[PDB]
Chains A and B, each alone.
Chain A
Amino acid sequence: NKRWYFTREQLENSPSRRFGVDPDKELSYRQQAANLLQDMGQRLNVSQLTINTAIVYMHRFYMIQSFTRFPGNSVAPAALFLAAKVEGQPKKLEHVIKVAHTCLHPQESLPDTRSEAYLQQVQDLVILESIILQTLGFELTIDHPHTHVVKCTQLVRASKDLAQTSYFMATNSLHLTTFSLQYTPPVVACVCIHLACKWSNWEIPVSTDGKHWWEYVDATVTLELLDELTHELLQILEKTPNRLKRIWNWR
């Protein structure tokens, strides 16, 4: 149960580091894979959940393999094809390949679907899916923070707004950080609600007892940690152009 959770030191010494990739470079490689997954996922008309599942597949895949060996641009499409099958929104192989091609090469034009080249990239995708399955040890059922967000928001009787912002925090927490490799989904969900409250100038009333709200969601959570993680998430959010704009109250 602690197989896919890592210490910061484990995160520092990743397979990619061991092949001369800077911390920051690797983080960038991850954000780009998530961006590609989101673009493809939107075009294929799968749900955010499916895109998210594919993103976790990717995140975990790169704790075992190196980016120097497996490019985000190759792994992302296969991860998404797989996540779409697993999440019950199956997309056809040719379909994911066609969309992958337009996302990566907007100006090229699809090869003859009869060519030896195209036949080879279809076979490369199938091969990469098998490699992913084997790297993850066929552990494919993923829990996301969003599940816990829905539950918890109600458990503070939050505005619709606040709830919308919390899910947004969760999705961006998938794109921008490695929280999913370090903290359980319920913890992350607490982090997201916390940042959403601070961002909306919302205050959750101290419980009748004197127990904080998050204590009803996960017992391991402390204010120190919440403040640390929200500050981290907020910092990367500030570095992402237009991202905060989407939740910025413009009035």
Chain B
Amino acid sequence: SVECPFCDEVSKYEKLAKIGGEVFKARHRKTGQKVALKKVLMENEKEGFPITALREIKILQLLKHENVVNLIEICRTKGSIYLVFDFCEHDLAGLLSNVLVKFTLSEIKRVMQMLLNGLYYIHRNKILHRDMKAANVLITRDGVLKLADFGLARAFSLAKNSQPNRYTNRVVTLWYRPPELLLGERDYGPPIDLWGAGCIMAEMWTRSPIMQGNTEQHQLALISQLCGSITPEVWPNVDNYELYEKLELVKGRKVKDRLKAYVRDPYALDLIDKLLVLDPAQRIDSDDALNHDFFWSDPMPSDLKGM
């Protein structure tokens, strides 16, 4: 037996149920405190401990914020490893799909405010989440929103000294994946996360992912039927991409028009329009979005506890 002061055995927790990629809900055996246990998958891993897990851990250990999921500790098994997180009862997908659930404008304001605040926080810390979707947005029993699942997140940098960034391009789920990525961009930044937020905002009313593509080409056509067509006029330098016309695009902004039915409030629609902006550099950022008159109107943001 070897000494192990700083990695407790997961036996301190009692496994209750697969809520998830193996995710278990569990209960601390002494305090009753609820947690989520995420086991580290070693399917093959012919290179010791998975570098991606090292990465995710480094990032979770960095990010400590009210609207970001909280890694409590790492547990061993005596061999496997489990990431232990503060437990969250609900997740946005489960709520947006359950018809027995209804948001007022005020609580929706509240949701979007916590979400944009989480993004602002992770970006201020030089992290890209890269997996924006409703199912990665958690909500605790007391109505606090938390961003989860950083297994696809990545640190970024101030890419100067004339050497553009070479980040991975096949990142973020298709329905939430921003235009930049679909054209093969590798020098992208925080705006990719902001784009998905757009899709989710609309999802608060459509109760369903606004843009569901078969393939990437289907995603781009579908995206175009809402946001207009790509053009060096709308998006200066768009030309620069090797897949511009080489991808059989359609020359052809019904964005505010197609959603008027679901989302009633003008400011909300304006904000969604400023999130779902084609040119990433012209796309609203988390700071200005939090500032949008949408959060500063009569139906002010309200807690969710109630519901």
Contact = CB atoms under 8 A, between A and B. Distances in A.
Contacts of B5: 64, 137
Contacts of A65: 2-3
A131 interface: yes
B47 A140 contact: no
B76 A92 contact: no
Interface string B39-57: 0000000111101001001
Interface in A74-128: 81-82, 85-86, 90, 92-93, 125-126
A138 B33 CA distance: 23
Contacts of B79: 130
A199 B25 CA distance: 60
Interface residues of B, number: 21
A90 B61 CA distance: 21
A224 interface: no
A129 interface: yes
A223 interface: no
A85 B7 contact: no
B164 to A, nearest CB: 18
B246 interface: no
Contact of A138 (B48, B51, B74): B74
B307 interface: no
B57 A140 contact: yes
A82 B282 CA distance: 41
Contacts of B51: 85, 90
Interface in B234-276: none
B223 to A, nearest CB: 33
Contacts of A64: 3, 5
A125 B58 contact: no
B3 A129 contact: no
B3 A93 contact: no
A136 interface: yes
B74 A140 contact: no
Nearest to A64: B3
A166 B62 CA distance: 29
Contact of A129 (B46, B49, B62): B49
Contacts of A130: 48-49, 79
Contacts of A90: 47, 51
Interface in A151-207: none
Contact of A134 (B47, B54, B62, B76): B76
Contacts of B62: 141
Interface of B: 2-7, 46-49, 51, 54, 57-58, 61-62, 73-74, 76, 79, 81
26 contacts: A64-B3, A65-B2, A65-B3, A69-B2, A81-B48, A82-B49, A86-B54, A86-B58, A90-B47, A125-B48, A129-B48, A130-B48, A131-B2, A133-B7, A133-B49, A133-B81, A134-B7, A134-B76, A135-B6, A136-B6, A138-B7, A139-B6, A140-B54, A140-B57, A141-B58, A141-B62
Given A93-B46, A135-B2, 15 more contacts: A69-B2, A85-B48, A85-B49, A86-B58, A93-B47, A130-B48, A134-B6, A134-B76, A135-B4, A137-B7, A137-B74, A138-B7, A139-B61, A141-B58, A141-B61
